[PDB]
Design a binder for this molecule. Structure first.
Ligand code: CA
Ligand code: ZN
Ligand code: ZN
Length: 386
């Protein structure tokens, strides 16, 4: 895997994508129009795929041999069947908002959003431009070329080992946490589009992982992907506390941050740092007295050490908590399909049985997360009532 793409497969994905549309059109659901919107993202993906097939009408063989497209269509079918099955098992819970199956539909919608953004970035106007994809940051670009050359997409394991040579990765828990941020399409593959977005968010390249640890992993202000209405909702509690701020990612504008803050008048405003790294904007904003309380907390981090040449560490408890951020606690964070049903001793990490088995059968060393020895295992129930 992944195998070549036949026209019979593309017709199969379309039959699947349509089934998801029919399910989400249900008035009993009453989805949110705010991005990501799956009822718009799917027909756009379909309409763009036709554009791709339109340009490769006379040259279909070369399209099926394209490594990126084989991966994309593989993930498209997997993420679509995952959504269809989500409606199947969830049953009545889908209708009640803020339910665990319903929340997973939001996570999947965000991934479908990331997929279309990647497809339009790699196939502009329906033509493959992957090998000539320009990585914005220079220092990040020369790294990719040295390690992967003209490759559009690479396996996570290959990407992890490569990045490890320049920016050290102390443990597998840091690796899994790193993957949760950079692997937008969630297909165990890293593309130039994904790599570009990440290296733009956590610039400079010289202190890449040292920036990501201090801005996302251990920073209360980090909110990942949120809607502006969701930013107003959380900051509304601290509307009587000028200086209260949070920063988020936007699915409609990848690669840049959006900082929400509380004024003295009692308003919630929102700015976008443009040409300076996030920590440089937070430091300056801290001196100005606008960015004072991350998530309303009186303990604001000192990021001034990032400008200096060199030097902080992160607990493994913080890495594990970061992995549980972008989704619900129910989901296994390895496959992001099945729910947890087994606990590993003595590290206490949770997962599903299929992943643990797949890791052991693949001659893996110990726990899939921390790679520590497995003394014993015990089963857990994640959905006790339903
Ligand atoms: Ca990916
Ligand atoms: Zn799993
Ligand atoms: Zn473990």
């Amino acid at each position: 895997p992944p195998g070549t793409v036949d026209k019979k497969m593309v017709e199969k994905c379309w039959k699947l994508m349509d089934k998801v549309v029919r399910l989400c059109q249900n008035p009993k659901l009453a989805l949110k129009n705010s991005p990501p919107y799956i009822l718009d993202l799917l027909p756009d993906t379909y309409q763009h795929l036709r554009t791709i097939l339109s340009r490769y009408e006379g040259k279909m063989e070369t399209l099926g041999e394209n490594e990126y497209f084989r991966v994309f269509m593989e993930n498209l079918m997997k993420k679509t069947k995952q959504t269809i099955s989500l409606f199947k098992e969830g049953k009545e819970r889908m209708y009640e908002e803020n339910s665990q199956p319903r929340r997973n539909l939001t996570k999947l919608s965000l991934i479908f959003s990331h997929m279309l953004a990647e497809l339009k970035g790699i196939f502009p106007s329906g033509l493959f431009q992957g090998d000539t994809f320009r990585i914005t940051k220079a220092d990040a670009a020369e790294f990719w070329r040295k390690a992967f050359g003209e490759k559009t997409i690479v396996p996570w394991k290959s990407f992890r080992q490569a990045l490890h040579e320049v920016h050290p990765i102390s443990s597998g828990l840091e690796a899994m946490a790193l993957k949760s941020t950079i692997d937008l399409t969630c297909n165990d593959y890293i593309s130039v589009f994904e790599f570009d977005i990440f290296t733009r968010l956590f610039q400079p390249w010289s202190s890449l992982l040292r920036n990501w640890n201090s801005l996302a992993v251990t920073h209360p202000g980090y909110m990942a992907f949120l809607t502006y209405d969701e930013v107003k909702a959380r900051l509304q509690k601290f509307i009587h506390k000028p200086g209260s701020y949070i920063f988020r990612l936007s699915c409609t504008r990848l690669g840049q941050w959006a900082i929400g803050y509380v004024t003295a008048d009692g308003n919630i405003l929102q700015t976008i740092p443009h040409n300076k790294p996030l920590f440089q904007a937070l430091i300056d904003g801290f001196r100005e007295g606008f960015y004072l309380f991350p998530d309303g907390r009186n303990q604001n981090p000192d990021l001034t050490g990032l400008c200096e040449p060199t030097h902080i560490k992160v607990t493994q408890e913080q890495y594990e908590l970061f992995c549980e951020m972008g989704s619900t606690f129910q989901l296994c964070k390895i496959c992001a399909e099945n729910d947890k049903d087994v606990k590993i001793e003595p590290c206490g990490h949770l997962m599903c049985t299929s992943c643990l088995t797949s890791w052991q059968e693949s001659e893996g060393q110990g726990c899939p997360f921390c790679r520590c020895e497995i003394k014993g295992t015990e089963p857990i129930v994640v959905d006790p009532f339903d």
